[PDB]
Amino acid sequence: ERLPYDASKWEFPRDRLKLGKPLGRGGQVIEADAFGIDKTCRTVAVKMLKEGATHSEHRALMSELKILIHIGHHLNVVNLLGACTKPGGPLMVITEFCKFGNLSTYLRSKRNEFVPYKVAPEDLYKDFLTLEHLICYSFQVAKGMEFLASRKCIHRDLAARNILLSEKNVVKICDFLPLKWMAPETIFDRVYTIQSDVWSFGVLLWEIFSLGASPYPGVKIDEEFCRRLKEGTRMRAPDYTTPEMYQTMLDCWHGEPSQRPTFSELVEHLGNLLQANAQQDRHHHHHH
Ligand SMILES: O=C(Nc1cncnc1)c1c(Cl)ccc2c(Nc3cccc(C(F)(F)F)c3)noc12
């Protein structure tokens, strides 16, 4: 809100947008066509308020926009393309469009199209999810969080429902029961810090390697849940996890926030895990 707004760089004409079917509601996000928004026609996502909403919501939408302008560009964070702020129409924030939707559902739908890895004749696993994909998505989300962390940002709601999937397996962090993703201090003291987001990154990890599963299955989210979380109880390994990966899930869920890895340590670690899987996959593919 204190951050300045460079209209000469981000302002887009309202009549250069044809709004289409809605995506989500909470303001509301919509799919759309933007003409000339980049250097001829492109698909975009527009977040706009309603008719007569609370001046506050306007203020909120504006500050959300300035935050995005502040954060900057990174391949793994939803990209801001423009915004209509001047008088004449409603306030709109325009970002790139990700066709495949949130990561959880996308994964949830590939449960009948998964193989640990591929070998000849690999044409039987066309459009199949594999460990490499899963670790790759985890690597990218980590890089985007290391980025955001590097800018003093704090997501506060990092989950699979807030990860978008684009062309060529590129995931992006965006921001549209949350208790299931919160760390102990965040639930009991109401404290949000970069470390608590790592806690959540851990919950995200579990979601990915459980192909879109809901965390803490069958548990009610009542007082007992909160107590067990506080006493050291943790989720069991998901169905598509590897041993190293599950352990990383455990590290992120460390009770002592300072003892949780950092997003830089996580990037460093997943990068390696990805490179090893790759190597094994090369040997698997070579022999058979
Ligand atoms: O959901 C959005 N776009 C979108 C893209 N593709 C498919 N569906 C929706 C979106 C739109 Cl239309 C406008 C602003 C933001 C947005 N802003 C944001 C605010 C604070 C922090 C962050 C993040 F950097 F943490 F991601 C993003 N995240 O996601 C959006």
Swiss-Prot record:
Tissue distribution: Detected in cornea (at protein level). Widely expressed.
Result of changing residue 125 to F: Strongly reduced autophosphorylation. Reduces phosphorylation of PLCG1
Coiled coil spans: none
Residues carrying Phosphotyrosine: 125
Record PTM text: N-glycosylated.
Disulfide bond entries: 153-174
Complex and partners: Homodimer in the presence of bound dimeric VEGFA, VEGFC or VEGFD ligands; monomeric in the absence of bound ligands. Can also form heterodimers with FLT1/VEGFR1 and KDR/VEGFR2. Interacts (tyrosine phosphorylated) with LFYN, NCK1, PLCG1. Interacts (tyrosine-phosphorylated active form preferentially) with DAB2IP (via C2 domain and active form preferentially); the interaction occurs at the late phase of VEGFA response and inhibits KDR/VEGFR2 activity. Interacts with SHBSH2D2A/TSAD, GRB2, MYOF, CBL and PDCD6. (Microbial infection) Interacts with HIV-1 Tat.
Free-text note regarding domains: The second and third Ig-like C2-type (immunoglobulin-like) domains are sufficient for VEGFC binding.
Biological role: Tyrosine-protein kinase that acts as a cell-surface receptor for VEGFA, VEGFC and VEGFD. Plays an essential role in the regulation of angiogenesis, vascular development, vascular permeability, and embryonic hematopoiesis. Promotes proliferation, survival, migration and differentiation of endothelial cells. Promotes reorganization of the actin cytoskeleton. Isoforms lacking a transmembrane domain, such as isoform 2 and isoform 3, may function as decoy receptors for VEGFA, VEGFC and/or VEGFD.
Name of the molecule in the record: Vascular endothelial growth factor receptor 2
Gene: KDR
Residues of the full protein shown: 818 to 1171 of 1356
